Amino acid sequence: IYGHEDIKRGLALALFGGEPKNPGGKHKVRGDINVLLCGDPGTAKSQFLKYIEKVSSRAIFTTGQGASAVGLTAYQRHPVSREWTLEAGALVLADRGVCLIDEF
DNA sequence: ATGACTGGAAACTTTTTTGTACAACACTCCAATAAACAT
């Protein structure tokens, strides 16, 4: 898709994600570049995200109605022979990568 | 479990009758006026 040069500039800078350091003395300040896109439905906004997930090394893709508070980061037991085992969602396995959330 | 039911459910359309707002209207008056009836 040709056009929207200002949109393509923000996608390349967000791929690096910066360098999360510790600028304070006791507080851990996060250092990630978070970009929130929102356009008029009709200019194909989801096709701009399907390109960065193939040129990177780790990227996922989820929807809105396909997940909730359970399938997010952590949620119960193993009801087979009295056991307890915690699970994880989708943001934990996507370490040091670029996450793509559709229908927010 | 999430995904399935009934169970309730907040803005939000409708009217609306309220005052106002401005429309006429018969309008008393007028202002010569004009002819007439004196000169």
Curated annotation (Swiss-Prot):
Record-listed ADP binding positions: S46, Q47
- Cellular location of this protein? Nucleus; Chromosome
Superkingdom assignment: Eukaryota
Modification after translation is described as: Phosphorylation by the CDC7-DBF4 complex during G1/S phase is required for the initiation of DNA replication.
Please state which protein family the record places this protein in.
Belongs to the MCM family.
Q: What else is known?
A: Early fractionation of eukaryotic MCM proteins yielded a variety of dimeric, trimeric and tetrameric complexes with unclear biological significance. Specifically a MCM467 subcomplex is shown to have in vitro helicase activity which is inhibited by the MCM2 subunit. The MCM2-7 hexamer is the proposed physiological active complex.
Q: What does this protein do?
A: Acts as a component of the MCM2-7 complex (MCM complex) which is the replicative helicase essential for 'once per cell cycle' DNA replication initiation and elongation in eukaryotic cells. Core component of CDC45-MCM-GINS (CMG) helicase, the molecular machine that unwinds template DNA during replication, and around which the replisome is built.
Q: Which disease is this protein implicated in?
A: Deafness, autosomal dominant, 70: A form of non-syndromic sensorineural hearing loss. Sensorineural deafness results from damage to the neural receptors of the inner ear, the nerve pathways to the brain, or the area of the brain that receives sound information. DFNA70 is characterized by slowly progressive, postlingual hearing impairment.
Q: How does it assemble?
A: Component of the MCM2-7 complex. The complex forms a toroidal hexameric ring with the proposed subunit order MCM2-MCM6-MCM4-MCM7-MCM3-MCM5. Component of the CMG helicase complex, a hexameric ring of related MCM2-7 subunits stabilized by CDC45 and the tetrameric GINS complex. Interacts with DBF4. Interacts with KAT7. May interact with MCM10. Component of the replisome complex composed of at least DONSON, MCM2, MCM7, PCNA and TICRR. Forms a co-chaperone complex with DNAJC9 and histone H3.3-H4 heterodimers.
Record protein name field: DNA replication licensing factor MCM2
From what organism does this protein derive?
Answer: Homo sapiens
Gene responsible for this protein = MCM2
Give the shown range, full length included.
485 to 589 of 904
